[PDB]
Amino acid sequence: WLGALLDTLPTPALTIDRTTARRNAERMRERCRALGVRLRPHVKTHKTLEGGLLATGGTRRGIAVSTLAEARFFADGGFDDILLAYPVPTARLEECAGLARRLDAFHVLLDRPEALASLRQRPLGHGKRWLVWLKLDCGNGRAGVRPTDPAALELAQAIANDAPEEVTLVGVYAHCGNTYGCSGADTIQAIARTTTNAVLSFVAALRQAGVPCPQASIGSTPSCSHPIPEMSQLTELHPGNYIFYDLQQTQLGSCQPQDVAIRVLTRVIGHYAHRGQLLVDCGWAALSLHGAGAGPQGCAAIDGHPELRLVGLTQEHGLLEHAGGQMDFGRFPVGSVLALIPYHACATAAMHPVYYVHEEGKVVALWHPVRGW
Amino acid sequence: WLGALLDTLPTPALTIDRTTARRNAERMRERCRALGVRLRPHVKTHKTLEGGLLATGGTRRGIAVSTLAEARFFADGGFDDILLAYPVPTARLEECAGLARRLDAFHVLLDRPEALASLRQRPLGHGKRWLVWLKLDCGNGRAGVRPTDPAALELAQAIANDAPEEVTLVGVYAHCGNTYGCSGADTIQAIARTTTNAVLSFVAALRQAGVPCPQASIGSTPSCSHPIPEMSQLTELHPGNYIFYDLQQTQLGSCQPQDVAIRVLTRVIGHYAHRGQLLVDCGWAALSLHGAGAGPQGCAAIDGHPELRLVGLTQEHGLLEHAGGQMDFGRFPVGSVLALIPYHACATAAMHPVYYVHEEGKVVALWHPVRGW
Numbered sequence: 237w238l239g240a241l242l243d244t245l246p247t248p249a250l251t252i253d254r255t256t257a258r259r260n261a262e263r264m265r266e267r268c269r270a271l272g273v274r275l276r277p278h279v280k281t282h283k284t285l286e287g288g289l290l291a292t293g294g295t296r297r298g299i300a301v302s303t304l305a306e307a308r309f310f311a312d313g314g315f316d317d318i319l320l321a322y323p324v325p326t327a328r329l330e331e332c333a334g335l336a337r338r339l340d341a342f343h344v345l346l347d348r349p350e351a352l353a354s355l356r357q358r359p360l361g362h363g364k365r366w367l368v369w370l371k372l373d374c375g376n377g378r379a380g381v382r383p384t385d386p387a388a389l390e391l392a393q394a395i396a397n398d399a400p401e402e403v404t405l406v407g408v409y410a411h412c413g414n415t416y417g418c419s420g421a422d423t424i425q426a427i428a429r430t431t432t433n434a435v436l437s438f439v440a441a442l443r444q445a446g447v448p449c450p451q452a453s454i455g456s457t458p459s460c461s462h463p464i465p466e467m468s469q470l471t472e473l474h475p476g477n478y479i480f481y482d483l484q485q486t487q488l489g490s491c492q493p494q495d496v497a498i499r500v501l502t503r504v505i506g507h508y509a510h511r512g513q514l515l516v517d518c519g520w521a522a523l524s525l526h527g528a529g530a531g532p533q534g535c536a537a538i539d540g541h542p543e544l545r546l547v548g549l550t551q552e553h554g555l556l557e558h559a560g561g562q563m564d565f566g567r568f569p570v571g572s573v574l575a576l577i578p579y580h581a582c583a584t585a586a587m588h589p590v591y592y593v594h595e596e597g598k599v600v601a602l603w604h605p606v607r608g609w
Numbered sequence: 610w611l612g613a614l615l616d617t618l619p620t621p622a623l624t625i626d627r628t629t630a631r632r633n634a635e636r637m638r639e640r641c642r643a644l645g646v647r648l649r650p651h652v653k654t655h656k657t658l659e660g661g662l663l664a665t666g667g668t669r670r671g672i673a674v675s676t677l678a679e680a681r682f683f684a685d686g687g688f689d690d691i692l693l694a695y696p697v698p699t700a701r702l703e704e705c706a707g708l709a710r711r712l713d714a715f716h717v718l719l720d721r722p723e724a725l726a727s728l729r730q731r732p733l734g735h736g737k738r739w740l741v742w743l744k745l746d747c748g749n750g751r752a753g754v755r756p757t758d759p760a761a762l763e764l765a766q767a768i769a770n771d772a773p774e775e776v777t778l779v780g781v782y783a784h785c786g787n788t789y790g791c792s793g794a795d796t797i798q799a800i801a802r803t804t805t806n807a808v809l810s811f812v813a814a815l816r817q818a819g820v821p822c823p824q825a826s827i828g829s830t831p832s833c834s835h836p837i838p839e840m841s842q843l844t845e846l847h848p849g850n851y852i853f854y855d856l857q858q859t860q861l862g863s864c865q866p867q868d869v870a871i872r873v874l875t876r877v878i879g880h881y882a883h884r885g886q887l888l889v890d891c892g893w894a895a896l897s898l899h900g901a902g903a904g905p906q907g908c909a910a911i912d913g914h915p916e917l918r919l920v921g922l923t924q925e926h927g928l929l930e931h932a933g934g935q936m937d938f939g940r941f942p943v944g945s946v947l948a949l950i951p952y953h954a955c956a957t958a959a960m961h962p963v964y965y966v967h968e969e970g971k972v973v974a975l976w977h978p979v980r981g982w
């Protein structure tokens with residue numbers, strides 16, 4: 237479809253503005269340069285080699301992934317310095333070890349002594365150590381050890397020193413995912429600040445105890461979009477969603493509408509005057525239901541038409557009302573193309589086997605994401 | 610993974626009990642035989658050749674699909690008598706016509722004179738007619754013409770008689786999707802009855818007007834699971850979800866827990882005592898958020914453990930509480946496998962590139978679904 241005009245694509249179609257995405261990627265890289273920290277982009281928003289190449293500024297080095305299928309896909313694509321940003325899967329250690337042996341640098345995360353115990357009973361060998369990060373829970377309420385829990389310091393000690401030829405402690409890793417529960421720069425920054433200070437305190441505690449911890453990593457798209465100076469005391473930031481942004485991030489204050497690279501293109505396929513509704517060929521199969529539970533009106537906005545809203549999604553159909561009761565079927569003929577702005581980029585992207593990547597109205601590339609586990 | 614024990618699979622893993630699914634398929638076929646009607650299973654719940662083969666009782670004939678990608682996939686798989694159960698996509702008529710020419714019987718649906726007009730300006734040729742069904746709106750509130758709207762009868766007349774060598778009216782098609790908004794057999798049957806009687810009335814109206822309409826088709830999984838005798842006056846039923854069922858259908862009363870063929874297997878990957886939570890390796894990427902907006906507690910139940918409930922899903926993590934405040938970490942060690950029963954089979958299945966199909970504890974096949982548009 238290279239060269240094709242967007243309104244020519246078969247819908248529903250996930251489109252990515254390459255100019256916007258390139259810009260988002262370069263901006264995050266510059267924020268990190270200004271802070272003096274490295275950027276380790278998380279790839280789970282797009283799951284593509286091409287997106288990885290952009291986020292990484294062409295180097296193919298320094299990413300985080302959320303599954304072993306991503307790890308393998310990006311490894312096969314020539315990436316390295318790959319962090320599996322997930323409690324290391326002790327049931328699949330053979331797969332992890334295969335990656336650790338193929339890659340110059342494959343990093344894993346853990347937060348349980350039994351997980352460290354599992355790594356010990358499956359040595360890598362071959363002059364390779366498990367490159368282990370300690371996952372810190374700093375308010376996220378998910379995985380990781382609490383920085384004020386004595387268990388944390390001891391686990392860090394165990395990872396760093398207890399078998400230095402089989403296992404090394406690369407650093408601590410926190411994810412301030414809680415920034416999603418609060419709107420406005422001020423609250424986002426407070427969470428960033430709490431998380432940053434918790435990490436810094438923990439690292440200071442480690443250095444006082446003699447536990448070598450060379451790296452410290454936090455990041456979420458909301459906090460990395462408006463960074464605080466305290467972040468220059470860390471070594472690495474690992475946001476991911478920012479490469480695309482979405483309506484959720486626009487509502488949070490992370491970005492402006494112009495920063496959202498992603499749309500789902502859909503065609504009007506029906507008028508129903510007796511109901512006041514347009515029928516479009518985008519249902520939850522192209523969109524997901526993210527944004528609904530917090531109904532369908534929250535799943536997407538119609539780009540350039542605030543008057544319209546979603547009022548129904550089935551697997552392959554969506555219903556649009558003017559919810560001014562004042563619909564104008566003449567302005568939206570059957571066959572015309574609307575651009576939906578989805579609530580959650582990661583969720584929408586996971587529904588598409590292909591992304592139509594465009595510049596100035598025309599398709600310039602096709603990106604095909606990996607999926608699965 | 611053939612022969613493998615289920616607890617051996619890499620999680621999260623979508624599993625289908627082949628004995629349950631075979632049973633569901635044969636039961637629906639028998640209901641239809643008892644009624645004297647044909648079964649045209651909709652394949653969108655599973656989107657696999659293998660599921661199509663079961664639903665179809667081995668014949669590979671008589672299905673409904675929801676997209677041109679399904680149409681093509683099932684055509685390439687040797688199926689025929691395929692109905693595209695969707696307003697015919699007038700922007701992609703070349704694709705439709707390619708299928709109409711390759712297949713003995715490719716059926717399309719419409720509900721707009723302009724859509725019929727579009728079919729006329731793109732004749733099939735080669736001794737082939739567009740095989741057109743009229744979509745009826747009988748309370749569903751989606752697509753189709755209302756049976757009491759004079760426009761319906763005229764469109765049916767136009768399809769049947771206005772260009773009999775280019776276009777034929779195969780029948781009327783209704784989908785009682787509204788059965789999803791009401792629990793209990795009685796209300797489900799009322800909707801089935803309203804829909805059936807509306808269709809029958811419309812067909813009687815057609816015969817009085819001299820419009821040949823040989824087929825009449827309704828169906829949804831809730832109404833076809835407890836059919837009414839009035840349905841024997843139709844010619845065809847087209848449910849789809851019943852091949853798997855799910856928690857939603859169990860709550861509606863369509864099926865019993867034993868009829869649900871589908872699970873998502875997930876591993877406990879973490880204990881968090883200070884929160885009372887288990888961490889499992891199934892997030893929304895393996896589950897979808899269906900069942901949430903009507904929070905996460907509604908997305909799935911843990912098979913054999915009513916005590917547990919979901920309280921959080923991120924892309925790749927889920928959180929389980931005992932919500933008796935009384936968790937018992939000893940009964941759920943890290944590494945153990947739980948079976949989630951998802952809310953909406955179709956939504957969950959759309960998240961998986963492979964289904965692990967098993968009999969008596971062991972994997973017997975891998976089904977790979979098509980996706981996209």
Ligand SMILES: Cc1ncc(COP(=O)(O)O)c(CNC[C@@H](N)C(=O)O)c1O
Nearest residue numbers: 550551651694784829830847848849850
């Ligand atoms: C047009 C059409 N025909 C048949 C079916 C099968 O219904 P069941 O899922 O078996 O009850 C459907 C499916 N219905 C609803 C979907 N559009 C959805 O939103 O999930 C159908 O649409």
Ligand SMILES: Cc1ncc(COP(=O)(O)O)c(CNC[C@@H](N)C(=O)O)c1O
Nearest residue numbers: 278321411456457474475476477923924
């Ligand atoms: C462990 C881990 N590290 C980094 C990120 C990137 O965060 P952003 O999406 O860019 O804000 C994540 C992602 N977070 C939340 C997901 N688990 C989800 O539920 O969507 C992460 O998990």
Ligand SMILES: [Cl-]
Nearest residue numbers: 524525897898
């Ligand atoms: Cl969803």
Ligand SMILES: [Zn+2]
Nearest residue numbers: 477580582583
């Ligand atoms: Zn996300």
Ligand SMILES: [Zn+2]
Nearest residue numbers: 850953955956
């Ligand atoms: Zn469904």
